[PDB]
């Protein structure tokens, strides 16, 4: 029902190149490829898509004044208008707004150090129907704005780069027990 701290989610656009409903999702490789790329997931039965390197976990949610209190130097629910940490669930690196380009749009990629203004991303409702301070349910359509550059997390044409222009971002969660099977797991196969 709700998106709470430390709930593993994805990030997922829809892009149309001559009526494509190609629901490409935000992937990040890590490990020698710092930049982010797109993992197209609308051929989800034609291609059983690589979903290991696409999941992100909300490490910590804070309002903007709380982020300034942190820059003066636990499952809470998050609200619209808050600046969140997006860890990459696999590589452990935090998603940040890099200072590199490949016009005026910075590249979107991973990093290690949680400090600074680059790791954090402010959320915005993409609606007049939904507004500031109220909760973010499962399946909403939101906007991620960087804190450092104050650029939107823009979908170029198919790069992903932090630019001045909006793009919707849908959030469908992945997970939220001990000794029990959970999808996406990696296991060995004992016989007897």
């Amino acid at each position: 029902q709700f998106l709470r701290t430390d709930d593993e989610v994805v990030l997922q656009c829809t892009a149309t190149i001559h009526k494509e409903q190609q629901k490409l999702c935000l992937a990040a490789e890590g490990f020698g490829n710092r930049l982010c790329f797109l993992e197209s997931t609308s051929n989800s039965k034609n291609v059983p898509p690589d979903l290991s390197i696409c999941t992100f976990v909300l490490e910590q949610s804070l309002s903007v004044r709380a982020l300034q209190e942190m820059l003066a130097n636990g499952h809470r629910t998050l609200l619209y208008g808050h600046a969140i940490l997006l860890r990459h669930s696999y590589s452990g690196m935090y998603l940040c707004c890099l200072s590199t380009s490949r016009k005026l749009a910075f590249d979107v990629g991973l990093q290690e150090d949680t400090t600074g203004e680059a790791c954090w991303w402010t959320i915005h409702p993409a609606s007049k129907q939904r507004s500031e301070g109220e909760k973010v349910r499962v399946g909403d359509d939101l906007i991620l704005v960087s804190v450092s550059s104050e650029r939107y997390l823009h979908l170029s044409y198919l790069h992903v780069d932090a630019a001045f222009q909006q793009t919707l971002w849908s959030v469908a969660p992945i997970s939220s027990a001990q000794g029990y099977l959970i999808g996406g797991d990696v296991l060995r196969l004992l016989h007897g």
Partner: peptide
């Protein structure tokens, strides 16, 4: 380190990216 002043100044860096010197020098003869 004011925070907001630094950020804004970086946004002012990010556009007109210091290749402005051609538009400086090419005036000084004409």
């Amino acid at each position: 380190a004011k925070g907001e002043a630094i950020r804004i100044r970086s946004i002012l860096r990010s556009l007109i990216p210091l290749g402005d010197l051609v538009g400086v020098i090419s005036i000084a003869f004409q």
